Design a protein around this nucleic acid. Structure first.
Ligand SMILES: [Mg+2]
Ligand SMILES: [Mg+2]
Ligand SMILES: [Mg+2]
Ligand SMILES: [Mg+2]
Ligand SMILES: [Mg+2]
Ligand SMILES: [Mg+2]
Ligand SMILES: [Mg+2]
Ligand SMILES: [Mg+2]
Ligand SMILES: [Mg+2]
Ligand SMILES: [Mg+2]
Ligand SMILES: [Mg+2]
Ligand SMILES: [Mg+2]
Ligand SMILES: [Mg+2]
Ligand SMILES: [Mg+2]
Ligand SMILES: [Mg+2]
Ligand SMILES: [Mg+2]
Ligand SMILES: [Mg+2]
Ligand SMILES: [Mg+2]
Ligand SMILES: [Mg+2]
Ligand SMILES: [Mg+2]
Ligand SMILES: [Mg+2]
Ligand SMILES: [Mg+2]
Ligand SMILES: [Mg+2]
Ligand SMILES: [Mg+2]
Ligand SMILES: [Mg+2]
Ligand SMILES: [Mg+2]
Ligand SMILES: [Mg+2]
Ligand SMILES: [Mg+2]
Ligand SMILES: [Mg+2]
Ligand SMILES: [Mg+2]
Ligand SMILES: [Mg+2]
Ligand SMILES: [Mg+2]
Ligand SMILES: [Mg+2]
Ligand SMILES: [Mg+2]
Ligand SMILES: [Mg+2]
Ligand SMILES: [Mg+2]
Ligand SMILES: [Mg+2]
Ligand SMILES: [Mg+2]
Ligand SMILES: [Mg+2]
Ligand SMILES: [Mg+2]
Ligand SMILES: [Mg+2]
Ligand SMILES: [Mg+2]
Ligand SMILES: [Mg+2]
Ligand SMILES: [Mg+2]
Ligand SMILES: [Mg+2]
Ligand SMILES: [Mg+2]
Ligand SMILES: [Mg+2]
Ligand SMILES: [Mg+2]
Ligand SMILES: [Mg+2]
Ligand SMILES: [Mg+2]
Ligand SMILES: [Mg+2]
Ligand SMILES: [Mg+2]
Ligand SMILES: [Mg+2]
Ligand SMILES: [Mg+2]
Ligand SMILES: [Mg+2]
Ligand SMILES: [Mg+2]
Ligand SMILES: [Mg+2]
Ligand SMILES: [Mg+2]
Ligand SMILES: [Mg+2]
Ligand SMILES: [Mg+2]
Ligand SMILES: [Mg+2]
Ligand SMILES: [Mg+2]
Ligand SMILES: [Mg+2]
Ligand SMILES: [Mg+2]
Ligand SMILES: [Mg+2]
Ligand SMILES: [Mg+2]
Ligand SMILES: [Mg+2]
Ligand SMILES: [Mg+2]
Ligand SMILES: [Mg+2]
Ligand SMILES: [Mg+2]
Ligand SMILES: [Mg+2]
Ligand SMILES: [Mg+2]
Ligand SMILES: [Mg+2]
Ligand SMILES: [Mg+2]
Ligand SMILES: [Mg+2]
Ligand SMILES: [Mg+2]
Ligand SMILES: [Mg+2]
Lengths: 101, 151, 127, 98, 206, 79, 115
RNA sequence: AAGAACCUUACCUGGUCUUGACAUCCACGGAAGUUUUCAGAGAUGAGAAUGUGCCUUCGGGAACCGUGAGACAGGUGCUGC
RNA sequence: CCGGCCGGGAACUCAAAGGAGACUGCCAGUGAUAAACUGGAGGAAGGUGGGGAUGACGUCAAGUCAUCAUGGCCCUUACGACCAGGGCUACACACGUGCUACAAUGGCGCAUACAAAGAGAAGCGACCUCGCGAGAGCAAGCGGACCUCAUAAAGUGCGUCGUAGUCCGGAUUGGAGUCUGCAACUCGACUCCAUGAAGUCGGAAUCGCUAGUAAUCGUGGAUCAGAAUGCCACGGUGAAUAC
């Protein structure tokens, strides 16, 4: 699903784990209802944009691992709805038989 | 069904008037599966009917249902090619069920105030045969009597 | 001493205990009159106690959970018929011929894939 | 006491795993209630079967996660050491809890 | 196209899951991706070694891979040197330890992967698709099969229009879940295009 | 509308406005931040917001304050 | 039954009577009758004149009728003078709150037209 | 499409880059990194500090980084006839 | 102290595993001395019990080269690649599929009873305490038969409106906000306040549905930072009709 699109997703994952899985203090702790409400809260949202545009975990699309398909994803398997089926009825996802109730 | 002759489901009697005739009347009156609302209306109607008519409930409902009951109804059958109006003797199970539907169908219209009031008035007018339900049987007869030529 | 019958009409599962004594019917620490109000039929639980008379013979302590109104009321009807086993086959000859002891399995059909709800297909566009 | 809880995907791999862990405890140092079953988790998934269009056509899957308990009611010295370093049974997760 | 995967429908009943491990919802996804990384790698590396399937287990952070194969001597090599070379590189991408085991298969013509990989390999060497297909169908019935359906879809013979052609010899009851049917597919990348090769091998009734 | 914790402007647009206001009136500021709100100090400036394919000059008045910059730069053209 | 600009209802409960005022809804009306000290169940015919004058000063607190109509007309006319996206939306006769304008929009756009 | 504010995004506008964002090599220089400043819409370009490790053929290493060179990498471009 | 709270119990519901069971197996016609058909007992269930999965050879050179793989073909200072905006949400109009309606078997208030299924670690987030309310602070427990989202709603029971474009509808807009998020103007969701449109049952046509089904009420999940009237599941009440 375009090698560039898969390759730009590794920036988004690596660069997010660096900054905002650590520097959420800038948004969470500082922008809060307490004594820092004056210029300290203004300097937080000011300094939050100094960071790169990527890093925010909202900007990760979350696509299939094997192919890179953006749609049809499943968080349990980490796959597309096509590749989970290809892998399930084959013997790769443990315990995953056809349901019928 | 093409060749699948199977019988019908059994029904239940209504607690306060343990029977069958008016138990089905509740089902025809019902909308959206709300039997609690519908059954409260039929009791309310028959209690207001029994006060005015000066009879019981089963016999008050009977002397009312029989006055809107069809004897013969009109189907149309193409045996050979053409399309004409063939009257036929209605079956005893459908006979009273077809009457119940005409009482309720007339009660949808004729917007007095309450559903309990409207049924009570329709069944009261059915007793002295001058409602809309008796008119709907009267026309059904006229088709059968006029088109009696066809067997 | 103290006889028992289960009953479990439609998801709901009754638990009917029955003893020889008063005519009262206790249910989940509530009276039968106040627990089952105006809904459709209170006396579906008392239907099985007609061919075999109650009046002031058998007292009923019942417990039930699951389902709604008629699911529980019908589960009690089966629970009582199952519970009436103190005179084994003398009662069940007359009781079965009016239905009653038949479980009545019919549960809600699952939602089929593609269909909007069990049987309801969406619509049809033919151009 | 030690509440031992274990779960698996296969319903008939966990049975011998629960039988062996009870027997390597009951026989070696006494005491066991039994295999308490617990409710089975059924994580269903309803993926589209086709690669393009055909919303009506799907395949529905599930993964039965079968739980089991053991429950011993005395911290025995022979039993507590036999639980550790002596489990094995591949494809069967186990979590001892004091 | 409208037929269910014959392996997939029998996974609970007759056939076994190849990846046999439990995992909690957090790890499951990454544990399944690492499972694919070794399987993709180990299939491409051991090409001439003739591998049918790869069973993978994970008891308490220890990846026991199994390699079911027709030619076990080529997988091990001399003095189990290639097992140690596999054990190292597989253990890096997967997750810490490794325990590679090898299961021989004395009847290689009854395994669906090996028959399909044989036909595929033959198609790439300009062999006539019928002389590859029917020879595989005839060869495995003599040994001890009861079914052997074999489809070959694609261009085949350098044709303009594509055609699917199948030959079977015996009972191949696909709708029977009690029946053991080895099914597998493989892709023959010829000069004219891809040629798919499905194979069903009904061995036993239960 | 959103945001109680400080009306929002981009760092680059704030520092460009503060530098422009202290110096004096000059020319349209090429700015792409449509998202950014308008401050009282911006009144008088003719900043040019990016509509999509070009920059639209917007003379900021007393009223244009609580609103955002992209409101005065229609993107899609019709008839 | 003559409070504010208009309010002339009869045979109607007090809470629903005051909904007839522009600028007074259902919840606002209950705040009037709570502060005034009047039961919601009563109607204006049943009320006395001594109680109606207390309602007049109560609704005088809130902006109602032409005070409100002008406040709304000012705010809409303000937007159109700015020439903002909402203003362009208003004068063009098209829906404002980021709505779908392709299939529906009939309330703001009006009834159907020829092509 | 099992979910378009940005991302997704394949489209447009303008800015931009050509062994390239993603890969193994032939080899030149450096641990990797981390903190932090300036011009810019941002991509980017310019810095300033600190740190300077697992083996010694010690003209080298096994990774990582940034140069020049080509084998090339890349294409959600067309063809489901 | 009066709540499965308590020791305790291991009956029962439930939970799983391992199993019995239903086969025209049994009787009675009918059939042709057959298959079988009808009807009957026993039975929880009766003639494939209900439901699901399972889709023959092949058809439409059906769909997909944009999931992936893939032969050729074209592009390689651009048809490749990084970035800010914008756009995919445009709107004289036409259709498809829904939802909410047009009310009185109904609308709004107060008294309060009955589910099933699923979900959860940068998670789900109690009791609290602030708020008219979205929510906001402090934090309890739970990788769960325990802890939490979570009071199910139709349903009763009282009240009040009495057939009005209405106390029906709740569109559309103005203002004031809340959360998520680098960011909510293009272009989010929800909340409050005011606002109060079309609509009085729908032309020719026409669709689904044979019982826990249609109808109708809520409920959950997947994708998902946020963003369902869709999709996928779950249970409430529960009909009519089949000559
Ligand atoms: Mg690719
Ligand atoms: Mg996202
Ligand atoms: Mg049929
Ligand atoms: Mg079900
Ligand atoms: Mg659909
Ligand atoms: Mg269609
Ligand atoms: Mg049409
Ligand atoms: Mg047509
Ligand atoms: Mg096919
Ligand atoms: Mg299918
Ligand atoms: Mg133009
Ligand atoms: Mg008003
Ligand atoms: Mg309001
Ligand atoms: Mg919108
Ligand atoms: Mg962009
Ligand atoms: Mg360009
Ligand atoms: Mg083709
Ligand atoms: Mg085709
Ligand atoms: Mg096409
Ligand atoms: Mg062609
Ligand atoms: Mg005990
Ligand atoms: Mg016990
Ligand atoms: Mg005991
Ligand atoms: Mg027991
Ligand atoms: Mg027992
Ligand atoms: Mg079992
Ligand atoms: Mg037979
Ligand atoms: Mg016999
Ligand atoms: Mg016989
Ligand atoms: Mg005989
Ligand atoms: Mg005989
Ligand atoms: Mg005989
Ligand atoms: Mg005969
Ligand atoms: Mg005879
Ligand atoms: Mg005879
Ligand atoms: Mg005879
Ligand atoms: Mg007989
Ligand atoms: Mg039959
Ligand atoms: Mg059948
Ligand atoms: Mg069946
Ligand atoms: Mg079946
Ligand atoms: Mg069966
Ligand atoms: Mg075609
Ligand atoms: Mg492709
Ligand atoms: Mg295309
Ligand atoms: Mg080529
Ligand atoms: Mg070539
Ligand atoms: Mg292109
Ligand atoms: Mg679209
Ligand atoms: Mg729009
Ligand atoms: Mg939208
Ligand atoms: Mg509807
Ligand atoms: Mg409503
Ligand atoms: Mg209501
Ligand atoms: Mg209303
Ligand atoms: Mg209201
Ligand atoms: Mg709580
Ligand atoms: Mg709460
Ligand atoms: Mg306080
Ligand atoms: Mg409060
Ligand atoms: Mg909160
Ligand atoms: Mg709260
Ligand atoms: Mg759970
Ligand atoms: Mg709770
Ligand atoms: Mg919820
Ligand atoms: Mg719960
Ligand atoms: Mg009037
Ligand atoms: Mg009007
Ligand atoms: Mg009004
Ligand atoms: Mg009108
Ligand atoms: Mg009108
Ligand atoms: Mg209608
Ligand atoms: Mg007509
Ligand atoms: Mg509703
Ligand atoms: Mg819902
Ligand atoms: Mg969720
Ligand atoms: Mg819905």
């Amino acid at each position: 699903a375009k090698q560039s699109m898969k390759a730009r997703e590794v920036k988004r994952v690596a660069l997010a784990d660096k900054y905002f899985a650590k520097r959420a203090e800038l948004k969470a702790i500082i922008s809060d209802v307490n004594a820092a409400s004056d210029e300290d809260r203004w300097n937080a949202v000011l300094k939050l944009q100094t960071l790169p545009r990527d890093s925010s975990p909202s900007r990760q699309r979350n696509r299939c691992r094997q192919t890179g398909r953006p749609h049809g994803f499943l968080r349990k398997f980490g796959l597309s709805r096509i590749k989970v089926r290809e892998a399930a009825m084959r013997g790769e996802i443990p315990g995953l038989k056809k349901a019928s109730w | 069904p093409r060749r699948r002759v199977i019988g019908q489901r059994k029904i239940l009697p209504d607690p306060k008037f343990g029977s069958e005739l008016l138990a089905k009347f509740v089902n025809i009156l019902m909308v959206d599966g709300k039997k609690s609302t519908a059954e409260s209306i039929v009791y309310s109607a028959l209690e207001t009917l029994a006060q005015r008519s000066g009879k019981s409930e089963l016999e008050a409902f009977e002397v009312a249902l029989e006055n809107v009951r069809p004897t013969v109804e009109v189907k149309s059958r193409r045996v050979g090619g053409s399309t004409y109006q063939v009257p036929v003797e209605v079956r005893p199970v459908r006979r009273n069920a077809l009457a119940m539907r005409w009482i309720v169908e007339a009660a949808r219209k004729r917007g007095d105030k309450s559903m309990a009031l409207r049924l009570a008035n329709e069944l009261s007018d059915a007793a002295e045969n001058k409602g809309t339900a008796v008119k709907k049987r009267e026309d059904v007869h006229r088709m059968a009597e006029a088109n009696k030529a066809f067997a | 001493n103290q006889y028992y019958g289960t009953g479990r009409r439609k998801s709901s599962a009754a638990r009917v205990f029955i003893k020889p004594g008063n005519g009262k019917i206790v249910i989940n620490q509530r009276s039968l009159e106040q627990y089952f109000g105006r809904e459709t039929a209170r006396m579906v639980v008392r239907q099985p106690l007609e061919l075999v008379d109650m009046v002031e013979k058998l007292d009923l302590y019942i417990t039930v959970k699951g389902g709604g109104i008629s699911g529980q009321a019908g589960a009690i009807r089966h629970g009582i018929t199952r519970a009436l086993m103190e005179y084994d086959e003398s009662l069940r000859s007359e009781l079965r011929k009016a239905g009653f002891v038949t479980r009545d399995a019919r549960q809600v059909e699952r939602k089929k894939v593609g269909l909007r709800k069990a049987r309801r297909r969406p619509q049809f566009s033919k151009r | 006491r030690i509440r031992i809880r274990l779960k698996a995907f296969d319903h008939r791999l966990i049975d011998q795993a629960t039988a062996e862990i009870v027997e390597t405890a009951k026989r070696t140092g006494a005491q066991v209630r039994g295999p308490i079953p617990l409710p089975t988790r059924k994580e269903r998934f309803t993926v589209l079967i086709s690669p393009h269009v055909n919303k009506d056509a799907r395949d529905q899957y599930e993964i039965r996660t079968h739980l089991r308990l053991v429950d011993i009611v005395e911290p025995t010295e022979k039993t507590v050491d036999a639980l550790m370093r002596l489990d094995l049974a591949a494809g069967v997760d186990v979590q001892i809890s004091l | 196209g409208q037929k269910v995967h014959p392996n997939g429908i029998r996974l609970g009943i007759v056939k076994p899951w190849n990846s046999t491990w439990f995992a909690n919802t957090k790890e499951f996804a990454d544990n399944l991706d690492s499972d694919f990384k070794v399987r993709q790698y180990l299939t491409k590396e051991l090409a001439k070694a003739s591998v049918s399937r790869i069973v993978i287990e994970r008891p308490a952070k220890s990846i026991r891979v199994t390699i079911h194969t027709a030619r076990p001597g080529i997988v091990i090599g001399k003095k189990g040197e290639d097992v140690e070379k596999l054990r190292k590189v597989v253990a890096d991408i997967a997750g810490v330890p490794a325990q590679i085991n090898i299961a021989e298969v004395r009847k290689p013509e009854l395994d669906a992967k090996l028959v399909a990989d044989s036909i595929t390999s033959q198609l790439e060497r300009r062999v006539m698709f019928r002389r590859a297909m029917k020879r595989a169908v005839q060869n495995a019935m003599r040994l001890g099969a009861k079914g052997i359906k074999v489809e070959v879809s694609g261009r085949l013979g350098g044709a303009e229009i594509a055609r699917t052609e199948w030959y079977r010899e015996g009972r191949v009851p696909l709708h029977t879940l009690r029946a053991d049917i080895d099914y597998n597919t493989s892709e023959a990348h010829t000069t004219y295009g891809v040629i798919g090769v499905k194979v069903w091998i009904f061995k036993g009734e239960i | 509308r959103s945001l109680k914790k400080g009306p929002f402007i981009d760092l680059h647009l704030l520092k460009k406005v503060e530098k422009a206001v202290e110096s004096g009136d000059k020319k349209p500021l090429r700015t792409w931040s449509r998202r950014s709100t308008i401050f009282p100090n911006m009144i008088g400036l003719t900043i040019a917001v990016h509509n999509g394919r070009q920059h639209v000059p917007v003379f900021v008045t007393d009223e244009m304050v609580g609103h955002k910059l992209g409101e005065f730069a229609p993107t899609r053209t019709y008839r | 039954a003559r409070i504010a600009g208009i309010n002339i209802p009869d045979h109607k409960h007090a809470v629903i009577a005051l909904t007839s005022i522009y600028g007074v809804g259902k919840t606002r009306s209950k705040a009037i009758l709570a502060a005034a000290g009047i039961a919601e169940d009563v109607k204006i015919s049943e009320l006395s004149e001594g109680q109606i004058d207390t309602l007049r000063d109560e609704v005088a607190k809130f902006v109602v009728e032409g005070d409100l109509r002008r406040e709304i007309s000012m705010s809409i006319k303000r937007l159109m003078d700015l020439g903002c996206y909402r203003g362009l939306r208003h004068r063009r006769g098209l829906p404002v709150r980021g709505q779908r304008t392709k299939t529906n929009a009939r309330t703001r756009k009006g009834p159907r037209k020829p092509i």
